[PDB]
Subunit: 257 residues, 4 copies
């Protein structure tokens, strides 16, 4: 397997619809040793779900908390000597930030929270996982969406936060590359997951993507997963600071009839 | 003048080096009626400074505060019936966020403050100014920097914030366009202003820019000012969501002939 | 006027719908002295059309020909001492390159021709105008389209050539800036012009743009021309190698 | 192997330094069946070189000629039923297009030849290979360089041609995606190959890349190769019209040489 032996932490596994789940499947298939995090309440949900991947640890981490992030690495450090990759696959903004008119809906706090959890958290993982990742061709991969590059209806404050996320990825790539750590992002097409169920007309966004995309289909979690897997391998050691669109070609078209 | 009659609010005037000063010079020249904001302490500084532009109003506005922003438009609405443009020319991040290695230096609270003041504040001005700006070919312009697009040494957290500012500009363009309001940013090349005095090797950044840029020079506040003024005119009514680099061509090269 | 005194050559004026016409209107309004070029056949058409701008010269220039380009500058140099700006507003690709599936339709010669006229020509005006333009804060502006950045239906080979154009604008900015010449491009939203009449469903592209754009309207030749004018002014001396979208915000949205 | 069974055509193999060599190494290691093209004179060179990959075919194809391109697929179709991938790794401009001031050096013919060979040829392979590639998750990958996006010294006419190649890639992706064919590009950092030996100060460009990149190193042919390999696998079926930078992060920084 092209991740044989590599020790990789996956955040954001929540259901078997989660992009994290596709990432997990793809890495397990490639011989990685996996560890997972969960937010307070979902301890049991998550342990059950990822038991099939034979996890070396399953640990709490609510990225709102500097402490928990700190502890994540202390505990993980008891199990592993180094860390080969961190997969950041978490996002959040309050419900009210995410439909209707951007300017009517945006609030100071809701803007703040979305950035805190969806963007700052990536640098915070990087900050705390740094020393475990020094000098072993390590990797980080964040999950992002095209609403970072373009104004879309509904995505709103998450679009602005994903923008922050992508800038963070690049500043992080620059800051960690002296330690040999590569840092990249995968910009997924829309996928029906738990996060998606907040959005009332999601099936239509999906249909529009499949219609307008060059490949005339929707992406699935394995396509994304496999891509994240690859970006955590020795094969990608020439790639950093990069956004790879895994979106059936959506990003490259304009005006699909 | 091509801004004659237009009622424009300018934020971020702080010294005669400020980009906002260049913006003010250019708009006054072009016949705009001007109003300025200041942050608490600097009331006297700013009134003295912008007196030469015969301002219709010089009002407090610390964009940390939702209230003050709200009152800004209340007070301004007493003086003016509509508003034609808002020029956003404010940034801030804590000193610690701005040199050395990004990951060593970045903190949760510093990330937060940088975004709050540098990025969210744009949408907040839009949110509160919106009604005064309805259906008169109104305009918004934010100042940005190429550290939004690329990782640069030092810029760090401000880079991330600037990326957020630029997204905000686009989402605001989409949200306000039905009211005929155009929303854009100017991306200035580096210029020696008060904000620049925080950065310890700035003269060298300036010198590098001038060497590497196709135009072999550094931009000044009039080049920026004039561009901002343009983007607030009836001549730019086809332009929105856009970032216009005013940087002597810096953005379009890589690796000059001197390595 | 903010172009008062400036001596500017405008290419591509063909009808009063032409983007060049909007550019001409705007620069005349701003006090520029104008000169125009035309392709062989349209001499009378064009002379009539631009007479209202009181042109210093109206001269043939088919950018397929290196010699005609050369002679354009010889003749112009007999009228003016220096040249303040060149406005490039010309494109062309054979009809067959421009609808249906890109791969079906693209041909070696059609690819070639589209790039020759649509892109190479920009550097060729630069090459030959350069010495008239040295050290007077001169300018060049090309017209481009978002079909350069994204794959669109129909635009095909012209999109590829637009992308080549845009690069030629950047390499030109880099090559000419030591002489103080600024080089930029204005990326226009779609406008119903003679070039547009080649495209069978154009009214629908227009309607889509107006629907999907943040400003909910179509741009016109005055919005484009005003921007071209500005990019030829002393006000814009900090700007080069830039693409300015004049498209009612279309470039910045996705899925609307 | 993640390309086991896949039938892939590789253009541009010229020496064991070629980027095509690294791509070939990678894909053979992943179980691909390989075929190679060469330009007239280099038949023996290339047969010797790629013998270690056990090629199903080694065929002439000068992309100046529509006939040779056509015949490449006729011959290849005698050996294989379908084709899984085409790797386009070929560029050329005449010597005189490639150093000095862009505008002094660009010529009508040189511009033409650069685009014909470096850009049009990709769509030409697509055109003729399309029928062998229908409905099997097939792939195309072109090699490109950041000189397409930015103006750089020396690259000149090739930069404009690369810009054209990247648009061709996007329009090809949109035109072939109804047949399930994905089409992408890899934007390599500079690598010392035969094409590089035309450029007189190449070692310095390399050294500058390494200094300014986040990863503080030069990419090699395997890094590029492996990425190309991946873009031709089933794992990459959600990726098209993309440019992947395999350049040790060069593309995302600015002013990395200012201390
Ligand atoms: N769903 C789509 O269409 C789509 C498209 C592009 C990108 N994405 C992104 O992919 C990522 C994974 O999301 P998904 O689609 O698999 O949805 P999901 O709802 O399964 O995952 C969202 C994750 O964020 C986690 N989370 C929320 N707050 C957290 C916190 N404070 N600390 C730690 N974890 C927290 C949740 O537990 C969950 O695992 C997100 O970054 C999302 O932006 C989704
Ligand atoms: N100076 C440069 O090189 C450069 C380059 C690119 C972009 N810009 C942008 O131009 C803008 C103006 O910057 P400058 O360069 O003139 O520096 P400046 O110091 O004169 O402007 C900074 C301004 O920010 C204001 N400010 C800070 N926190 C504030 C708050 N909480 N509420 C209200 N106002 C606040 C100050 O009053 C001041 O007027 C900034 O957006 C800056 O990022 C500057
Ligand atoms: N029409 C749109 O919707 C639109 C949108 C974006 C960009 N543009 C660009 O704006 C420019 C102006 O054209 P327009 O749309 O106003 O249409 P137009 O038909 O008025 O302009 C076409 C011009 O190109 C000239 N031309 C063609 N072959 C030529 C040659 N060999 N030598 C010299 N001149 C030649 C013709 O004389 C004509 O004036 C073009 O480059 C076009 O690509 C148009
Ligand atoms: N070398 C770099 O630093 C670098 C960086 C980015 C991209 N690239 C690209 O990668 C590809 C490979 O370059 P390389 O460095 O391996 O060089 P190389 O010289 O080893 O290979 C270049 C190839 O183009 C082929 N070629 C030239 N004219 C041809 C024609 N008319 N018909 C068919 N084939 C022809 C040559 O035979 C040769 O195989 C090129 O597209 C190049 O621009 C190279
Ligand atoms: C917080 C959050 C993050 C997400 N990351 C991806 N998605 C899925 C999505 C795709 C397309 C659109 Cl237009 C929208 Cl609105 C949502 C998320 C949804 C939520 C609610
Ligand atoms: C808060 C703040 C915002 C700014 N926006 C632009 N500048 C000037 C600058 C330009 C380039 C670089 Cl690399 C740096 Cl570090 C600073 C700012 C400086 C400060 C202190
Ligand atoms: C040769 C030529 C060049 C052009 N440059 C722009 N246009 C018009 C146009 C605008 C929008 C769209 Cl979507 C399309 Cl397909 C065409 C051109 C038309 C022709 C015929
Ligand atoms: C035809 C051709 C294509 C190429 N694509 C890349 N290179 C090598 C190279 C890499 C970086 C730089 Cl800045 C330069 Cl100038 C050259 C090529 C060289 C040739 C001769």
């Amino acid at each position: 397997g092209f991740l044989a032996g590599k020790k990789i932490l996956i955040t954001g596994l929540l259901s078997n619809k989660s992009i994290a789940y596709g990432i997990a499947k793809a890495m397990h298939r490639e011989g990685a040793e996996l560890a997972f995090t969960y937010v307070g309440q979902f301890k049991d949900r998550v342990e059950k779900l990822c038991a099939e991947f034979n996890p070396a640890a399953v640990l709490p981490c609510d990225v709102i908390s500097d402490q928990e992030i700190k502890d994540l690495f202390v505990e993980l450090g008891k199990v592993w000597d180094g860390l080969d990759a961190i997969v950041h696959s978490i996002a959040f903004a309050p419900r009210d930030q995410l439909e209707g008119n951007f300017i009517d809906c945006v609030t100071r706090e809701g803007f703040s929270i979305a950035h805190d959890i969806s963007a700052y958290s990536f640098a915070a993982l990087a900050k705390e996982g740094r020393s475990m990742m020094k000098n072993r061709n390590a990797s980080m991969v964040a999950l992002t969406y095209i609403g970072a590059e373009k104004a879309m209806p509904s995505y709103n404050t998450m679009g602005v936060a994903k923008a922050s996320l992508e800038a963070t990825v690049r500043y992080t790539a620059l800051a960690l590359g002296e330690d040999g750590i590569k840092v990249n992002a995968v910009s997924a097409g829309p996928i029906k997951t738990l996060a998606a169920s907040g959005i009332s007309n999601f099936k239509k966004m999906l249909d529009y993507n499949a219609m307008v995309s060059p490949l005339k289909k929707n992406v699935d979690i394995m396509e994304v997963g496999n891509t994240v897997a690859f970006l955590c391998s020795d094969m990608a050691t020439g790639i950093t600071g990069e956004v790879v669109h895994v979106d059936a070609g959506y990003h490259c078209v304009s005006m699909g009839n």
